Design an enzyme around this catalytic site. Structure first.
Site, mmCIF file in Angstrom:
data_model
loop_
_atom_site.group_PDB
_atom_site.id
_atom_site.type_symbol
_atom_site.label_atom_id
_atom_site.label_comp_id
_atom_site.label_asym_id
_atom_site.label_seq_id
_atom_site.Cartn_x
_atom_site.Cartn_y
_atom_site.Cartn_z
ATOM 1 N N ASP A 156 -5.868 7.088 6.754
ATOM 2 C CA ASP A 156 -5.412 6.304 5.610
ATOM 3 C C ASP A 156 -5.187 4.840 5.946
ATOM 4 O O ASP A 156 -4.107 4.284 5.740
ATOM 5 C CB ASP A 156 -4.152 6.912 4.995
ATOM 6 N N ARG A 160 -1.146 -1.499 3.197
ATOM 7 C CA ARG A 160 0.245 -1.023 3.118
ATOM 8 C C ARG A 160 0.724 -0.377 4.435
ATOM 9 O O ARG A 160 1.935 -0.283 4.700
ATOM 10 C CB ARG A 160 0.393 -0.031 1.970
ATOM 11 N N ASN A 161 -0.231 0.073 5.238
ATOM 12 C CA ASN A 161 0.039 0.683 6.538
ATOM 13 C C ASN A 161 -0.156 -0.292 7.692
ATOM 14 O O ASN A 161 -0.215 0.125 8.837
ATOM 15 C CB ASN A 161 -0.844 1.924 6.742
ATOM 16 N N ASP A 174 1.412 4.448 10.525
ATOM 17 C CA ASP A 174 1.196 5.532 9.603
ATOM 18 C C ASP A 174 2.618 6.031 9.356
ATOM 19 O O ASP A 174 3.193 6.757 10.170
ATOM 20 C CB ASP A 174 0.276 6.589 10.226
HETATM 21 C C1 LIG Z 1 10.852 -5.952 5.486
HETATM 22 O O1 LIG Z 1 10.526 -5.649 6.857
HETATM 23 C C2 LIG Z 1 10.268 -4.358 7.147
HETATM 24 O O2 LIG Z 1 10.783 -3.471 6.409
HETATM 25 N N1 LIG Z 1 9.935 -4.223 8.451
HETATM 26 C C3 LIG Z 1 9.643 -2.972 9.026
HETATM 27 N N2 LIG Z 1 9.775 -1.777 8.289
HETATM 28 C C4 LIG Z 1 9.437 -0.775 9.180
HETATM 29 C C5 LIG Z 1 9.382 0.603 9.038
HETATM 30 C C6 LIG Z 1 8.988 1.311 10.174
HETATM 31 O O3 LIG Z 1 8.927 2.671 10.016
HETATM 32 C C7 LIG Z 1 7.998 3.457 10.688
HETATM 33 C C8 LIG Z 1 6.631 3.119 10.677
HETATM 34 C C9 LIG Z 1 5.722 3.930 11.340
HETATM 35 C C10 LIG Z 1 6.182 5.063 12.056
HETATM 36 N N3 LIG Z 1 5.306 5.895 12.770
HETATM 37 C C11 LIG Z 1 3.912 5.806 12.776
HETATM 38 O O4 LIG Z 1 3.300 4.702 12.693
HETATM 39 N N4 LIG Z 1 3.351 6.905 13.422
HETATM 40 C C12 LIG Z 1 1.988 7.098 13.661
HETATM 41 C C13 LIG Z 1 1.065 6.030 13.763
HETATM 42 C C14 LIG Z 1 -0.262 6.289 14.015
HETATM 43 C C15 LIG Z 1 -1.233 5.117 14.077
HETATM 44 F F1 LIG Z 1 -2.539 5.480 14.003
HETATM 45 F F2 LIG Z 1 -1.133 4.277 13.026
HETATM 46 F F3 LIG Z 1 -1.102 4.277 15.124
HETATM 47 C C16 LIG Z 1 -0.730 7.592 14.174
HETATM 48 C C17 LIG Z 1 0.152 8.664 14.088
HETATM 49 C C18 LIG Z 1 1.514 8.408 13.849
HETATM 50 F F4 LIG Z 1 2.378 9.421 13.770
HETATM 51 C C19 LIG Z 1 7.557 5.354 12.070
HETATM 52 C C20 LIG Z 1 8.469 4.556 11.395
HETATM 53 C C21 LIG Z 1 8.676 0.698 11.412
HETATM 54 C C22 LIG Z 1 8.729 -0.674 11.561
HETATM 55 C C23 LIG Z 1 9.127 -1.421 10.428
HETATM 56 N N5 LIG Z 1 9.278 -2.784 10.300
#
Ligand SMILES: COC(=O)Nc1nc2cc(Oc3ccc(NC(=O)Nc4cc(C(F)(F)F)ccc4F)cc3)ccc2[nH]1
Length: 299
Positions: A156, A160-161, A174
């Site tokens: 996905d 937004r991601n 994600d």
């Molecule tokens: C106004 O400013 C904001 O609100 N700023 C801000 N808000 C936020 C929220 C936030 O929550 C998350 C995000 C992602 C996540 N895990 C996640 O990405 N896991 C993941 C990634 C991937 C792959 F492929 F993308 F890399 C593969 C598999 C997988 F499981 C956990 C918590 C993190 C950082 C952040 N910074």
């Protein structure tokens, strides 16, 4: 892999008594993310704002397993500048399971770019320019090249991601929250939700097929989002069986309002009907690196 992988506590475990939880950043039916202050999470004597993913009250075994799986997935992926940065975890007895990742202060790139529509010029201290847009594109391609090398498929990939940190560094993530099928309808505003079908490669609709080359298709849509400054793809089009038919046939989005010709060419390349004829992420890194360098050259 999954929740059953080994976990090196020496490397990853962070004391819960050095985490001060703050306000929520995001909440879905299966998990929440909270802003927090962590002291000395990167070994230096500093207090850092981080994002903590944890369970909501009343979480089942299935939910715990899912969060533990995510933690191991993130450890497996490893570190890259342009990927969500795992900083630590709290897993041992005496408190909730918590996954700690870097905080990206400008939030998601779609909303950010929308907020800059009156602050954009092609070539003004706080303005975005073509340099910015191509740099974000290049960075996402670098992150995806890295993810491809770890044998990961995103599934996905959308603006937004992508999160925007300080110094114009973008990070692929994600969230895995599903916030917009969970959000209270009283507080849902236009822009909150998006329709994932609009990012799916034809083979992903028709054959339910997810591959790295389907992520390249999605990356092309993300490029469109960047060079429309956060517009929604396929404006006005109804996403029905007809739309899908047209898509398999060769129908594509027109150029967005802020694109250069070379960037729209790249979108079209990413939207090749044959997955094997789309560029690879490595090829996109090279090409966008070239476009970036050409953009900033002297006369
Ligand atoms: C106004 O400013 C904001 O609100 N700023 C801000 N808000 C936020 C929220 C936030 O929550 C998350 C995000 C992602 C996540 N895990 C996640 O990405 N896991 C993941 C990634 C991937 C792959 F492929 F993308 F890399 C593969 C598999 C997988 F499981 C956990 C918590 C993190 C950082 C952040 N910074």
């Amino acid at each position: 892999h999954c929740e059953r992988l080994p976990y090196d506590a020496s490397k990853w475990e962070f004391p819960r008594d050095r985490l001060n939880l703050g306000k929520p950043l995001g909440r879905g039916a299966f998990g929440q993310v909270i802003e927090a202050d962590a002291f000395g999470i990167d070994k230096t004597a500093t207090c850092r704002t981080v994002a903590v993913k944890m369970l909501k009250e009343g979480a089942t075994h299935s939910e715990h397993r899912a969060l533990m799986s995510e933690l191991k997935i993130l450890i497996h992926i490893g570190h890259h500048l342009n990927v969500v940065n795992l900083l630590g975890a709290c897993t041992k007895p005496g408190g909730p399971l918590m996954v700690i990742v870097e905080f990206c202060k400008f939030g998601n790139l779609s909303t950010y770019l929308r907020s800059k529509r009156n602050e954009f010029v092609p070539y003004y201290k706080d303005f975005l320019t073509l340099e910015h847009l191509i740099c974000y594109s290049f960075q996402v391609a670098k992150g995806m090249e890295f993810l491809a090398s770890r044998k990961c498929i995103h599934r996905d990939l959308a603006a937004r991601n992508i999160l925007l940190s300080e110094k114009n560094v973008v990070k692929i993530c994600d969230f895995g929250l599903a916030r917009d099928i969970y959000k209270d309808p009283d507080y849902v505003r236009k822009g909150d939700a998006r329709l994932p079908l609009k990012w799916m490669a034809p083979e992903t609709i028709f054959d339910r097929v997810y591959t790295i080359q389907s992520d390249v298709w999605s990356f092309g849509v993300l490029l469109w989002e960047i060079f429309s400054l956060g517009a929604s793809p396929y404006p006005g089009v109804k996403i029905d069986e007809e739309f899908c038919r047209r898509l398999k046939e060769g129908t594509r989005m027109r150029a967005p309002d802020y694109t250069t010709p070379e960037m729209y060419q790249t979108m079209l390349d990413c939207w090749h009907g044959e997955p094997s004829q789309r560029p690879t992420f490595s090829e996109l890194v090279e090409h966008l690196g070239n476009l970036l360098q050409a953009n900033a050259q002297q006369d």
